[PDB]
């Protein structure tokens, strides 16, 4: 039939106590009071010209970002990868095995030079 008065008078007591609870769960403007950290000079001259914000300033920022990411993610791998196969893996036989390219009648071989004879006259099938 509804709340019996007592429970309500209690719930609002819990309400205002809950009111103050997460009215204390926020953060003052100063917190989090970030402890100091040693800073690299790299971001110092990134922001020294970033404040302008015009197109070409941030483009070269991204352009170095792409290249600096590339060298440490696509250059230094292939540096050691190519070192790994061509001088260690391929140095061991039967480690890297290749499909011989499918020679077709009429092709020429770079080393031999002999042409594979062209296949004989087709039955002349036309639609």
């Amino acid at each position: 039939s509804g709340y019996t008065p007592d429970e309500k008078l209690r719930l609002q007591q819990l309400r205002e106590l809950r009111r103050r609870w997460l009215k204390d769960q926020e953060l003052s403007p100063r917190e989090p009071v970030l402890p100091p950290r040693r800073v690299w000079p790299m971001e110092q001259f990134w922001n020294k010209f970033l404040q302008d914000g015009a197109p070409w300033k941030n483009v070269i920022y991204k352009t170095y970002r792409h290249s600096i990411f590339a060298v440490t993610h696509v250059l230094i791998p292939v540096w050691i990868i190519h070192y790994y196969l061509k001088y260690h893996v391929t140095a061991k036989p039967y480690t890297v095995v290749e499909r011989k390219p499918r020679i077709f009648p009429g092709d020429t071989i770079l080393e031999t030079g002999e042409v594979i004879p062209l296949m004989k006259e087709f039955p002349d099938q036309h639609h």
């Binding site: 039939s1 509804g2 309500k8 719930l11 809950r18 009215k23």
Partner: protein, 86 residues
């Protein structure tokens, strides 16, 4: 998603109850008890809360449904359930 303040949620419940045809759009009040002040019955409360459960997305429990019959105490339960503070 931005949160709903106490004014906002009381305003949201204000719209849906006002839209109800059984009540009269000028007698509506935030403390107006449903079955006596607005002249409703027990089998009108049920359709009120689902119309309240609809635009809010969550379900008030059945055990707390029969006593959920005051517009001010309507928003008190929802504000408690979502702890949204202005």
């Amino acid at each position: 998603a931005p949160p709903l303040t106490l004014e906002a949620i009381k305003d949201r419940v204000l719209y849906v109850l006002k839209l109800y045809d059984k009540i009269d759009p000028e007698k509506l009040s935030v403390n107006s008890h449903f079955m006596k002040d607005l002249g409703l019955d027990s089998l009108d409360q049920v359709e009120i809360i689902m119309a309240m459960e609809d635009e809010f997305g969550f379900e008030i429990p059945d055990i707390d449904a029969e006593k959920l019959m005051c517009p001010q105490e309507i928003v008190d339960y929802i504000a408690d359930k979502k702890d949204v503070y202005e």
